[PDB]
Each structure stands twice: as structure tokens, then as C-alpha cells.
């Protein structure tokens, strides 16, 4: 299946990503467009440590949830058409070959009707 969030152009929108096992001493994350960023979370849209956002590509991207409890959902401010598409949430997990990758598609419309 695919999880799609539908929103009207220009309206802030939140794409869910929750990791309930989150431990601030162990986990961190990043979001990417189209596919997940590579391990290390470079070229990411937005990136955290175990507690808070540590870098982002622009102020369009915010994490408004409680990051130390694993709510690393992405909020996109004033989305325009180019912002539509697949977003991938990568959770960095201790060890090798253990990272979690969660995909959400953003669909933007002019109306909900």
C-alpha cells in the first residue's frame, strides 16, 4: 500500500513518521525527497540528533512533534506544486542494516470539494 497525505496548495501539511522505540541516546533521523537519504543523513531535507533538529535545507521544513519520543513527523510550510511527491523518513538505528525507512506521498490540490 501507499500512504498519501492530500492537502491544498499553500496550506501547511504534516507527513507522519513515528518510531515508538526512540531513545535519545541511540536514535536520530533525517527526511529525504523521493528516496531516503543515505546512511549519515547528508543531502537531507531536515535532520535531527536524538533530541532536536540540527540542520535543514530551508525554513519550509519543521519538526513540530516530540522528537525524543519518536514523533519525527515532517511539517512543510506553504507547499507549492514542486513539493508534491514521495518523502522518506530514515531512522538511524544502532548497528548495521537496521535502519528504518518510512515513505509518505504528498499530494497537493487546488480544492478538496
PDB file of N, CA and C in Angstrom:
ATOM      1  N   UNK A   1       0.826  -1.200   0.000  1.00  0.00           N
ATOM      2  CA  UNK A   1       0.000   0.000   0.000  1.00  0.00           C
ATOM      3  C   UNK A   1       0.860   1.250   0.000  1.00  0.00           C
ATOM      4  N   UNK A   2       0.239   2.385  -0.287  1.00  0.00           N
ATOM      5  CA  UNK A   2       0.927   3.656  -0.163  1.00  0.00           C
ATOM      6  C   UNK A   2       0.123   4.565   0.755  1.00  0.00           C
ATOM      7  N   UNK A   3       0.816   5.276   1.638  1.00  0.00           N
ATOM      8  CA  UNK A   3       0.165   6.278   2.460  1.00  0.00           C
ATOM      9  C   UNK A   3       0.338   7.644   1.801  1.00  0.00           C
ATOM     10  N   UNK A   4      -0.784   8.296   1.532  1.00  0.00           N
ATOM     11  CA  UNK A   4      -0.805   9.563   0.812  1.00  0.00           C
ATOM     12  C   UNK A   4      -1.453  10.596   1.704  1.00  0.00           C
ATOM     13  N   UNK A   5      -0.822  11.754   1.837  1.00  0.00           N
ATOM     14  CA  UNK A   5      -1.458  12.864   2.535  1.00  0.00           C
ATOM     15  C   UNK A   5      -1.834  13.883   1.488  1.00  0.00           C
ATOM     16  N   UNK A   6      -3.116  14.226   1.465  1.00  0.00           N
ATOM     17  CA  UNK A   6      -3.637  15.178   0.500  1.00  0.00           C
ATOM     18  C   UNK A   6      -3.873  16.519   1.189  1.00  0.00           C
ATOM     19  N   UNK A   7      -3.374  17.598   0.592  1.00  0.00           N
ATOM     20  CA  UNK A   7      -3.542  18.930   1.162  1.00  0.00           C
ATOM     21  C   UNK A   7      -3.712  19.919   0.021  1.00  0.00           C
ATOM     22  N   UNK A   8      -4.289  21.068   0.335  1.00  0.00           N
ATOM     23  CA  UNK A   8      -4.448  22.135  -0.624  1.00  0.00           C
ATOM     24  C   UNK A   8      -3.151  22.942  -0.725  1.00  0.00           C
ATOM     25  N   UNK A   9      -2.807  23.355  -1.941  1.00  0.00           N
ATOM     26  CA  UNK A   9      -1.636  24.212  -2.160  1.00  0.00           C
ATOM     27  C   UNK A   9      -1.599  25.378  -1.173  1.00  0.00           C
ATOM     28  N   UNK A  10      -0.410  25.682  -0.663  1.00  0.00           N
ATOM     29  CA  UNK A  10      -0.229  26.791   0.256  1.00  0.00           C
ATOM     30  C   UNK A  10      -0.575  26.520   1.709  1.00  0.00           C
ATOM     31  N   UNK A  11      -1.191  25.376   1.989  1.00  0.00           N
ATOM     32  CA  UNK A  11      -1.557  25.047   3.360  1.00  0.00           C
ATOM     33  C   UNK A  11      -0.498  24.165   3.994  1.00  0.00           C
ATOM     34  N   UNK A  12      -0.043  24.539   5.182  1.00  0.00           N
ATOM     35  CA  UNK A  12       0.949  23.708   5.853  1.00  0.00           C
ATOM     36  C   UNK A  12       0.445  22.272   6.007  1.00  0.00           C
ATOM     37  N   UNK A  13       1.357  21.317   5.882  1.00  0.00           N
ATOM     38  CA  UNK A  13       0.955  19.921   5.829  1.00  0.00           C
ATOM     39  C   UNK A  13       1.962  19.101   6.616  1.00  0.00           C
ATOM     40  N   UNK A  14       1.483  18.062   7.303  1.00  0.00           N
ATOM     41  CA  UNK A  14       2.341  17.217   8.127  1.00  0.00           C
ATOM     42  C   UNK A  14       2.335  15.791   7.602  1.00  0.00           C
ATOM     43  N   UNK A  15       3.537  15.251   7.402  1.00  0.00           N
ATOM     44  CA  UNK A  15       3.715  13.885   6.934  1.00  0.00           C
ATOM     45  C   UNK A  15       4.174  13.027   8.100  1.00  0.00           C
ATOM     46  N   UNK A  16       3.400  11.991   8.434  1.00  0.00           N
ATOM     47  CA  UNK A  16       3.669  11.241   9.663  1.00  0.00           C
ATOM     48  C   UNK A  16       4.925  10.385   9.571  1.00  0.00           C
ATOM     49  N   UNK A  17       5.691  10.394  10.656  1.00  0.00           N
ATOM     50  CA  UNK A  17       6.727   9.402  10.875  1.00  0.00           C
ATOM     51  C   UNK A  17       6.944   9.222  12.368  1.00  0.00           C
ATOM     52  N   UNK A  18       6.519   8.073  12.899  1.00  0.00           N
ATOM     53  CA  UNK A  18       6.638   7.833  14.331  1.00  0.00           C
ATOM     54  C   UNK A  18       7.424   6.556  14.576  1.00  0.00           C
ATOM     55  N   UNK A  19       8.345   6.628  15.527  1.00  0.00           N
ATOM     56  CA  UNK A  19       9.163   5.484  15.909  1.00  0.00           C
ATOM     57  C   UNK A  19       9.102   5.360  17.427  1.00  0.00           C
ATOM     58  N   UNK A  20       8.206   4.503  17.916  1.00  0.00           N
ATOM     59  CA  UNK A  20       7.891   4.473  19.345  1.00  0.00           C
ATOM     60  C   UNK A  20       9.046   3.984  20.215  1.00  0.00           C
ATOM     61  N   UNK A  21       9.980   3.244  19.626  1.00  0.00           N
ATOM     62  CA  UNK A  21      11.140   2.752  20.373  1.00  0.00           C
ATOM     63  C   UNK A  21      12.248   3.791  20.520  1.00  0.00           C
ATOM     64  N   UNK A  22      12.003   5.011  20.045  1.00  0.00           N
ATOM     65  CA  UNK A  22      13.019   6.057  20.038  1.00  0.00           C
ATOM     66  C   UNK A  22      13.698   6.225  21.389  1.00  0.00           C
ATOM     67  N   UNK A  23      15.022   6.206  21.372  1.00  0.00           N
ATOM     68  CA  UNK A  23      15.798   6.528  22.551  1.00  0.00           C
ATOM     69  C   UNK A  23      16.727   7.666  22.202  1.00  0.00           C
ATOM     70  N   UNK A  24      16.704   8.727  22.988  1.00  0.00           N
ATOM     71  CA  UNK A  24      17.517   9.875  22.666  1.00  0.00           C
ATOM     72  C   UNK A  24      19.032   9.579  22.659  1.00  0.00           C
ATOM     73  N   UNK A  25      19.463   8.536  23.340  1.00  0.00           N
ATOM     74  CA  UNK A  25      20.878   8.188  23.329  1.00  0.00           C
ATOM     75  C   UNK A  25      21.315   7.382  22.161  1.00  0.00           C
ATOM     76  N   UNK A  26      20.384   6.888  21.362  1.00  0.00           N
ATOM     77  CA  UNK A  26      20.653   5.924  20.296  1.00  0.00           C
ATOM     78  C   UNK A  26      20.210   6.376  18.906  1.00  0.00           C
ATOM     79  N   UNK A  27      19.042   6.983  18.820  1.00  0.00           N
ATOM     80  CA  UNK A  27      18.457   7.253  17.509  1.00  0.00           C
ATOM     81  C   UNK A  27      18.619   8.686  17.039  1.00  0.00           C
ATOM     82  N   UNK A  28      18.520   8.863  15.722  1.00  0.00           N
ATOM     83  CA  UNK A  28      18.434  10.167  15.087  1.00  0.00           C
ATOM     84  C   UNK A  28      17.764   9.906  13.752  1.00  0.00           C
ATOM     85  N   UNK A  29      17.467  10.953  13.003  1.00  0.00           N
ATOM     86  CA  UNK A  29      16.739  10.753  11.762  1.00  0.00           C
ATOM     87  C   UNK A  29      16.978  11.838  10.753  1.00  0.00           C
ATOM     88  N   UNK A  30      16.549  11.567   9.529  1.00  0.00           N
ATOM     89  CA  UNK A  30      16.505  12.594   8.504  1.00  0.00           C
ATOM     90  C   UNK A  30      15.406  12.274   7.514  1.00  0.00           C
ATOM     91  N   UNK A  31      14.900  13.322   6.871  1.00  0.00           N
ATOM     92  CA  UNK A  31      13.941  13.203   5.783  1.00  0.00           C
ATOM     93  C   UNK A  31      14.600  13.471   4.441  1.00  0.00           C
ATOM     94  N   UNK A  32      14.189  12.717   3.425  1.00  0.00           N
ATOM     95  CA  UNK A  32      14.615  12.983   2.062  1.00  0.00           C
ATOM     96  C   UNK A  32      13.444  13.085   1.109  1.00  0.00           C
ATOM     97  N   UNK A  33      13.682  13.740  -0.012  1.00  0.00           N
ATOM     98  CA  UNK A  33      12.711  13.760  -1.111  1.00  0.00           C
ATOM     99  C   UNK A  33      12.977  12.598  -2.069  1.00  0.00           C
ATOM    100  N   UNK A  34      11.887  11.940  -2.487  1.00  0.00           N
ATOM    101  CA  UNK A  34      11.853  10.829  -3.473  1.00  0.00           C
ATOM    102  C   UNK A  34      12.377   9.503  -2.907  1.00  0.00           C
ATOM    103  N   UNK A  35      13.518   9.547  -2.222  1.00  0.00           N
ATOM    104  CA  UNK A  35      14.065   8.367  -1.566  1.00  0.00           C
ATOM    105  C   UNK A  35      14.709   8.790  -0.265  1.00  0.00           C
ATOM    106  N   UNK A  36      14.989   7.840   0.624  1.00  0.00           N
ATOM    107  CA  UNK A  36      15.650   8.205   1.875  1.00  0.00           C
ATOM    108  C   UNK A  36      17.072   8.628   1.631  1.00  0.00           C
ATOM    109  N   UNK A  37      17.546   9.594   2.429  1.00  0.00           N
ATOM    110  CA  UNK A  37      18.975   9.900   2.357  1.00  0.00           C
ATOM    111  C   UNK A  37      19.819   8.672   2.669  1.00  0.00           C
ATOM    112  N   UNK A  38      21.069   8.692   2.225  1.00  0.00           N
ATOM    113  CA  UNK A  38      21.980   7.607   2.550  1.00  0.00           C
ATOM    114  C   UNK A  38      22.316   7.657   4.032  1.00  0.00           C
ATOM    115  N   UNK A  39      22.852   6.556   4.546  1.00  0.00           N
ATOM    116  CA  UNK A  39      23.332   6.499   5.922  1.00  0.00           C
ATOM    117  C   UNK A  39      24.244   7.693   6.201  1.00  0.00           C
ATOM    118  N   UNK A  40      24.050   8.351   7.338  1.00  0.00           N
ATOM    119  CA  UNK A  40      24.790   9.571   7.620  1.00  0.00           C
ATOM    120  C   UNK A  40      23.951  10.814   7.409  1.00  0.00           C
ATOM    121  N   UNK A  41      22.849  10.646   6.682  1.00  0.00           N
ATOM    122  CA  UNK A  41      21.841  11.690   6.520  1.00  0.00           C
ATOM    123  C   UNK A  41      22.353  12.991   5.888  1.00  0.00           C
ATOM    124  N   UNK A  42      23.267  12.886   4.928  1.00  0.00           N
ATOM    125  CA  UNK A  42      23.684  14.058   4.164  1.00  0.00           C
ATOM    126  C   UNK A  42      22.726  14.281   3.000  1.00  0.00           C
ATOM    127  N   UNK A  43      22.715  15.505   2.477  1.00  0.00           N
ATOM    128  CA  UNK A  43      21.803  15.911   1.406  1.00  0.00           C
ATOM    129  C   UNK A  43      20.349  15.747   1.831  1.00  0.00           C
ATOM    130  N   UNK A  44      20.109  15.785   3.135  1.00  0.00           N
ATOM    131  CA  UNK A  44      18.761  15.585   3.637  1.00  0.00           C
ATOM    132  C   UNK A  44      17.987  16.897   3.641  1.00  0.00           C
ATOM    133  N   UNK A  45      16.664  16.799   3.642  1.00  0.00           N
ATOM    134  CA  UNK A  45      15.830  17.990   3.769  1.00  0.00           C
ATOM    135  C   UNK A  45      15.912  18.592   5.167  1.00  0.00           C
ATOM    136  N   UNK A  46      15.939  17.715   6.171  1.00  0.00           N
ATOM    137  CA  UNK A  46      15.980  18.116   7.565  1.00  0.00           C
ATOM    138  C   UNK A  46      16.539  16.918   8.334  1.00  0.00           C
ATOM    139  N   UNK A  47      17.239  17.193   9.427  1.00  0.00           N
ATOM    140  CA  UNK A  47      17.998  16.184  10.165  1.00  0.00           C
ATOM    141  C   UNK A  47      17.910  16.483  11.641  1.00  0.00           C
ATOM    142  N   UNK A  48      17.888  15.429  12.459  1.00  0.00           N
ATOM    143  CA  UNK A  48      17.870  15.556  13.923  1.00  0.00           C
ATOM    144  C   UNK A  48      19.040  14.842  14.533  1.00  0.00           C
ATOM    145  N   UNK A  49      19.263  15.103  15.822  1.00  0.00           N
ATOM    146  CA  UNK A  49      20.018  14.178  16.665  1.00  0.00           C
ATOM    147  C   UNK A  49      18.989  13.394  17.486  1.00  0.00           C
ATOM    148  N   UNK A  50      19.298  12.997  18.716  1.00  0.00           N
ATOM    149  CA  UNK A  50      18.301  12.272  19.484  1.00  0.00           C
ATOM    150  C   UNK A  50      17.242  13.155  20.124  1.00  0.00           C
ATOM    151  N   UNK A  51      17.432  14.470  20.053  1.00  0.00           N
ATOM    152  CA  UNK A  51      16.553  15.398  20.764  1.00  0.00           C
ATOM    153  C   UNK A  51      15.865  16.453  19.910  1.00  0.00           C
ATOM    154  N   UNK A  52      16.558  16.967  18.896  1.00  0.00           N
ATOM    155  CA  UNK A  52      16.114  18.176  18.211  1.00  0.00           C
ATOM    156  C   UNK A  52      16.632  18.251  16.783  1.00  0.00           C
ATOM    157  N   UNK A  53      16.035  19.147  15.996  1.00  0.00           N
ATOM    158  CA  UNK A  53      16.530  19.423  14.653  1.00  0.00           C
ATOM    159  C   UNK A  53      17.922  20.051  14.725  1.00  0.00           C
ATOM    160  N   UNK A  54      18.848  19.528  13.932  1.00  0.00           N
ATOM    161  CA  UNK A  54      20.213  20.048  13.927  1.00  0.00           C
ATOM    162  C   UNK A  54      20.610  20.725  12.615  1.00  0.00           C
ATOM    163  N   UNK A  55      19.884  20.445  11.535  1.00  0.00           N
ATOM    164  CA  UNK A  55      20.101  21.162  10.278  1.00  0.00           C
ATOM    165  C   UNK A  55      18.889  20.991   9.375  1.00  0.00           C
ATOM    166  N   UNK A  56      18.713  21.906   8.427  1.00  0.00           N
ATOM    167  CA  UNK A  56      17.648  21.792   7.432  1.00  0.00           C
ATOM    168  C   UNK A  56      17.987  22.614   6.206  1.00  0.00           C
ATOM    169  N   UNK A  57      17.419  22.210   5.078  1.00  0.00           N
ATOM    170  CA  UNK A  57      17.723  22.815   3.793  1.00  0.00           C
ATOM    171  C   UNK A  57      17.080  24.193   3.666  1.00  0.00           C
ATOM    172  N   UNK A  58      15.921  24.370   4.290  1.00  0.00           N
ATOM    173  CA  UNK A  58      15.301  25.685   4.382  1.00  0.00           C
ATOM    174  C   UNK A  58      14.231  25.697   5.461  1.00  0.00           C
ATOM    175  N   UNK A  59      13.727  26.888   5.753  1.00  0.00           N
ATOM    176  CA  UNK A  59      12.779  27.059   6.839  1.00  0.00           C
ATOM    177  C   UNK A  59      11.376  26.568   6.485  1.00  0.00           C
ATOM    178  N   UNK A  60      11.219  26.060   5.266  1.00  0.00           N
ATOM    179  CA  UNK A  60       9.998  25.373   4.848  1.00  0.00           C
ATOM    180  C   UNK A  60       9.737  24.112   5.678  1.00  0.00           C
ATOM    181  N   UNK A  61      10.810  23.488   6.163  1.00  0.00           N
ATOM    182  CA  UNK A  61      10.696  22.210   6.859  1.00  0.00           C
ATOM    183  C   UNK A  61      10.800  22.364   8.375  1.00  0.00           C
ATOM    184  N   UNK A  62       9.825  21.809   9.081  1.00  0.00           N
ATOM    185  CA  UNK A  62       9.820  21.841  10.552  1.00  0.00           C
ATOM    186  C   UNK A  62       9.451  20.491  11.121  1.00  0.00           C
ATOM    187  N   UNK A  63      10.009  20.166  12.285  1.00  0.00           N
ATOM    188  CA  UNK A  63       9.548  19.022  13.049  1.00  0.00           C
ATOM    189  C   UNK A  63       8.851  19.551  14.293  1.00  0.00           C
ATOM    190  N   UNK A  64       7.531  19.391  14.330  1.00  0.00           N
ATOM    191  CA  UNK A  64       6.708  20.011  15.359  1.00  0.00           C
ATOM    192  C   UNK A  64       6.333  19.064  16.494  1.00  0.00           C
ATOM    193  N   UNK A  65       6.653  17.783  16.344  1.00  0.00           N
ATOM    194  CA  UNK A  65       6.310  16.786  17.346  1.00  0.00           C
ATOM    195  C   UNK A  65       7.393  16.599  18.385  1.00  0.00           C
ATOM    196  N   UNK A  66       7.140  15.709  19.332  1.00  0.00           N
ATOM    197  CA  UNK A  66       8.109  15.455  20.386  1.00  0.00           C
ATOM    198  C   UNK A  66       9.171  14.475  19.878  1.00  0.00           C
ATOM    199  N   UNK A  67      10.279  15.032  19.413  1.00  0.00           N
ATOM    200  CA  UNK A  67      11.348  14.217  18.836  1.00  0.00           C
ATOM    201  C   UNK A  67      11.919  13.152  19.803  1.00  0.00           C
ATOM    202  N   UNK A  68      12.155  13.504  21.087  1.00  0.00           N
ATOM    203  CA  UNK A  68      12.693  12.449  21.958  1.00  0.00           C
ATOM    204  C   UNK A  68      11.724  11.289  22.234  1.00  0.00           C
ATOM    205  N   UNK A  69      10.455  11.423  21.855  1.00  0.00           N
ATOM    206  CA  UNK A  69       9.536  10.299  21.968  1.00  0.00           C
ATOM    207  C   UNK A  69       9.248   9.666  20.604  1.00  0.00           C
ATOM    208  N   UNK A  70      10.028  10.056  19.604  1.00  0.00           N
ATOM    209  CA  UNK A  70       9.964   9.396  18.321  1.00  0.00           C
ATOM    210  C   UNK A  70       8.981   9.966  17.326  1.00  0.00           C
ATOM    211  N   UNK A  71       8.373  11.101  17.659  1.00  0.00           N
ATOM    212  CA  UNK A  71       7.484  11.751  16.702  1.00  0.00           C
ATOM    213  C   UNK A  71       8.304  12.699  15.858  1.00  0.00           C
ATOM    214  N   UNK A  72       8.736  12.203  14.709  1.00  0.00           N
ATOM    215  CA  UNK A  72       9.622  12.963  13.843  1.00  0.00           C
ATOM    216  C   UNK A  72       8.906  13.288  12.531  1.00  0.00           C
ATOM    217  N   UNK A  73       7.590  13.440  12.642  1.00  0.00           N
ATOM    218  CA  UNK A  73       6.748  13.837  11.515  1.00  0.00           C
ATOM    219  C   UNK A  73       7.218  15.152  10.905  1.00  0.00           C
ATOM    220  N   UNK A  74       7.163  15.240   9.582  1.00  0.00           N
ATOM    221  CA  UNK A  74       7.653  16.414   8.864  1.00  0.00           C
ATOM    222  C   UNK A  74       6.516  17.377   8.560  1.00  0.00           C
ATOM    223  N   UNK A  75       6.675  18.628   8.967  1.00  0.00           N
ATOM    224  CA  UNK A  75       5.731  19.665   8.547  1.00  0.00           C
ATOM    225  C   UNK A  75       6.375  20.507   7.462  1.00  0.00           C
ATOM    226  N   UNK A  76       5.621  20.722   6.383  1.00  0.00           N
ATOM    227  CA  UNK A  76       6.064  21.542   5.260  1.00  0.00           C
ATOM    228  C   UNK A  76       5.199  22.805   5.191  1.00  0.00           C
ATOM    229  N   UNK A  77       5.838  23.965   5.336  1.00  0.00           N
ATOM    230  CA  UNK A  77       5.135  25.249   5.294  1.00  0.00           C
ATOM    231  C   UNK A  77       4.935  25.737   3.858  1.00  0.00           C
ATOM    232  N   UNK A  78       3.773  26.330   3.592  1.00  0.00           N
ATOM    233  CA  UNK A  78       3.454  26.918   2.287  1.00  0.00           C
ATOM    234  C   UNK A  78       3.872  26.068   1.085  1.00  0.00           C
ATOM    235  N   UNK A  79       3.422  24.807   1.043  1.00  0.00           N
ATOM    236  CA  UNK A  79       3.866  23.936  -0.049  1.00  0.00           C
ATOM    237  C   UNK A  79       3.359  24.421  -1.404  1.00  0.00           C
ATOM    238  N   UNK A  80       4.218  24.353  -2.414  1.00  0.00           N
ATOM    239  CA  UNK A  80       3.833  24.658  -3.789  1.00  0.00           C
ATOM    240  C   UNK A  80       3.921  23.350  -4.569  1.00  0.00           C
ATOM    241  N   UNK A  81       3.599  23.363  -5.853  1.00  0.00           N
ATOM    242  CA  UNK A  81       3.467  22.102  -6.568  1.00  0.00           C
ATOM    243  C   UNK A  81       4.711  21.233  -6.572  1.00  0.00           C
ATOM    244  N   UNK A  82       5.890  21.847  -6.644  1.00  0.00           N
ATOM    245  CA  UNK A  82       7.137  21.084  -6.662  1.00  0.00           C
ATOM    246  C   UNK A  82       7.342  20.270  -5.380  1.00  0.00           C
ATOM    247  N   UNK A  83       6.676  20.671  -4.303  1.00  0.00           N
ATOM    248  CA  UNK A  83       6.778  19.935  -3.050  1.00  0.00           C
ATOM    249  C   UNK A  83       6.003  18.623  -3.063  1.00  0.00           C
ATOM    250  N   UNK A  84       5.123  18.423  -4.040  1.00  0.00           N
ATOM    251  CA  UNK A  84       4.412  17.149  -4.098  1.00  0.00           C
ATOM    252  C   UNK A  84       5.384  16.012  -4.396  1.00  0.00           C
ATOM    253  N   UNK A  85       4.997  14.809  -4.004  1.00  0.00           N
ATOM    254  CA  UNK A  85       5.798  13.640  -4.280  1.00  0.00           C
ATOM    255  C   UNK A  85       6.081  12.816  -3.050  1.00  0.00           C
ATOM    256  N   UNK A  86       6.965  11.846  -3.225  1.00  0.00           N
ATOM    257  CA  UNK A  86       7.323  10.937  -2.149  1.00  0.00           C
ATOM    258  C   UNK A  86       8.343  11.568  -1.210  1.00  0.00           C
ATOM    259  N   UNK A  87       8.119  11.386   0.086  1.00  0.00           N
ATOM    260  CA  UNK A  87       9.064  11.747   1.137  1.00  0.00           C
ATOM    261  C   UNK A  87       9.422  10.486   1.899  1.00  0.00           C
ATOM    262  N   UNK A  88      10.687  10.383   2.285  1.00  0.00           N
ATOM    263  CA  UNK A  88      11.147   9.216   3.011  1.00  0.00           C
ATOM    264  C   UNK A  88      11.801   9.638   4.311  1.00  0.00           C
ATOM    265  N   UNK A  89      11.331   9.013   5.374  1.00  0.00           N
ATOM    266  CA  UNK A  89      11.796   9.218   6.736  1.00  0.00           C
ATOM    267  C   UNK A  89      12.758   8.094   7.119  1.00  0.00           C
ATOM    268  N   UNK A  90      14.019   8.446   7.376  1.00  0.00           N
ATOM    269  CA  UNK A  90      15.030   7.457   7.760  1.00  0.00           C
ATOM    270  C   UNK A  90      15.380   7.565   9.242  1.00  0.00           C
ATOM    271  N   UNK A  91      15.134   6.495   9.988  1.00  0.00           N
ATOM    272  CA  UNK A  91      15.524   6.424  11.395  1.00  0.00           C
ATOM    273  C   UNK A  91      16.835   5.701  11.528  1.00  0.00           C
ATOM    274  N   UNK A  92      17.850   6.406  12.022  1.00  0.00           N
ATOM    275  CA  UNK A  92      19.140   5.795  12.300  1.00  0.00           C
ATOM    276  C   UNK A  92      19.033   4.933  13.558  1.00  0.00           C
ATOM    277  N   UNK A  93      19.411   3.666  13.409  1.00  0.00           N
ATOM    278  CA  UNK A  93      19.318   2.654  14.463  1.00  0.00           C
ATOM    279  C   UNK A  93      20.714   2.084  14.740  1.00  0.00           C
ATOM    280  N   UNK A  94      21.048   1.835  16.020  1.00  0.00           N
ATOM    281  CA  UNK A  94      22.365   1.260  16.315  1.00  0.00           C
ATOM    282  C   UNK A  94      22.647  -0.044  15.585  1.00  0.00           C
ATOM    283  N   UNK A  95      23.900  -0.226  15.192  1.00  0.00           N
ATOM    284  CA  UNK A  95      24.306  -1.419  14.485  1.00  0.00           C
ATOM    285  C   UNK A  95      24.175  -1.264  12.987  1.00  0.00           C
ATOM    286  N   UNK A  96      24.220  -2.394  12.303  1.00  0.00           N
ATOM    287  CA  UNK A  96      24.299  -2.389  10.859  1.00  0.00           C
ATOM    288  C   UNK A  96      23.059  -3.029  10.247  1.00  0.00           C
ATOM    289  N   UNK A  97      22.608  -2.462   9.133  1.00  0.00           N
ATOM    290  CA  UNK A  97      21.469  -2.966   8.356  1.00  0.00           C
ATOM    291  C   UNK A  97      20.150  -2.940   9.135  1.00  0.00           C
ATOM    292  N   UNK A  98      20.057  -2.022  10.093  1.00  0.00           N
ATOM    293  CA  UNK A  98      18.910  -1.947  10.997  1.00  0.00           C
ATOM    294  C   UNK A  98      18.043  -0.709  10.817  1.00  0.00           C
ATOM    295  N   UNK A  99      18.456   0.203   9.940  1.00  0.00           N
ATOM    296  CA  UNK A  99      17.754   1.486   9.858  1.00  0.00           C
ATOM    297  C   UNK A  99      16.326   1.281   9.360  1.00  0.00           C
ATOM    298  N   UNK A 100      15.439   2.147   9.828  1.00  0.00           N
ATOM    299  CA  UNK A 100      14.031   2.110   9.456  1.00  0.00           C
ATOM    300  C   UNK A 100      13.756   3.183   8.414  1.00  0.00           C
ATOM    301  N   UNK A 101      13.031   2.808   7.372  1.00  0.00           N
ATOM    302  CA  UNK A 101      12.690   3.743   6.315  1.00  0.00           C
ATOM    303  C   UNK A 101      11.190   3.720   6.070  1.00  0.00           C
ATOM    304  N   UNK A 102      10.575   4.892   6.186  1.00  0.00           N
ATOM    305  CA  UNK A 102       9.128   5.047   6.112  1.00  0.00           C
ATOM    306  C   UNK A 102       8.794   6.068   5.024  1.00  0.00           C
ATOM    307  N   UNK A 103       7.938   5.688   4.077  1.00  0.00           N
ATOM    308  CA  UNK A 103       7.591   6.545   2.940  1.00  0.00           C
ATOM    309  C   UNK A 103       6.199   7.140   3.071  1.00  0.00           C
ATOM    310  N   UNK A 104       6.067   8.415   2.702  1.00  0.00           N
ATOM    311  CA  UNK A 104       4.763   9.085   2.647  1.00  0.00           C
ATOM    312  C   UNK A 104       4.707   9.934   1.386  1.00  0.00           C
ATOM    313  N   UNK A 105       3.612   9.844   0.636  1.00  0.00           N
ATOM    314  CA  UNK A 105       3.466  10.660  -0.562  1.00  0.00           C
ATOM    315  C   UNK A 105       2.626  11.886  -0.255  1.00  0.00           C
ATOM    316  N   UNK A 106       3.100  13.057  -0.674  1.00  0.00           N
ATOM    317  CA  UNK A 106       2.317  14.293  -0.554  1.00  0.00           C
ATOM    318  C   UNK A 106       1.620  14.583  -1.871  1.00  0.00           C
ATOM    319  N   UNK A 107       0.299  14.677  -1.819  1.00  0.00           N
ATOM    320  CA  UNK A 107      -0.498  15.059  -2.976  1.00  0.00           C
ATOM    321  C   UNK A 107      -1.130  16.422  -2.727  1.00  0.00           C
ATOM    322  N   UNK A 108      -0.824  17.395  -3.583  1.00  0.00           N
ATOM    323  CA  UNK A 108      -1.332  18.749  -3.421  1.00  0.00           C
ATOM    324  C   UNK A 108      -2.404  19.039  -4.468  1.00  0.00           C
ATOM    325  N   UNK A 109      -3.461  19.689  -4.030  1.00  0.00           N
ATOM    326  CA  UNK A 109      -4.599  20.006  -4.902  1.00  0.00           C
ATOM    327  C   UNK A 109      -4.980  21.462  -4.783  1.00  0.00           C
ATOM    328  N   UNK A 110      -5.788  21.948  -5.710  1.00  0.00           N
ATOM    329  CA  UNK A 110      -6.362  23.267  -5.578  1.00  0.00           C
ATOM    330  C   UNK A 110      -7.647  23.259  -4.772  1.00  0.00           C
ATOM    331  N   UNK A 111      -8.286  22.104  -4.599  1.00  0.00           N
ATOM    332  CA  UNK A 111      -9.570  22.029  -3.901  1.00  0.00           C
ATOM    333  C   UNK A 111      -9.731  20.682  -3.226  1.00  0.00           C
ATOM    334  N   UNK A 112     -10.626  20.597  -2.248  1.00  0.00           N
ATOM    335  CA  UNK A 112     -10.962  19.315  -1.637  1.00  0.00           C
ATOM    336  C   UNK A 112     -12.332  18.865  -2.117  1.00  0.00           C
ATOM    337  N   UNK A 113     -13.163  19.856  -2.442  1.00  0.00           N
ATOM    338  CA  UNK A 113     -14.556  19.681  -2.852  1.00  0.00           C
ATOM    339  C   UNK A 113     -15.359  18.935  -1.783  1.00  0.00           C
TER     340      UNK A 113
END
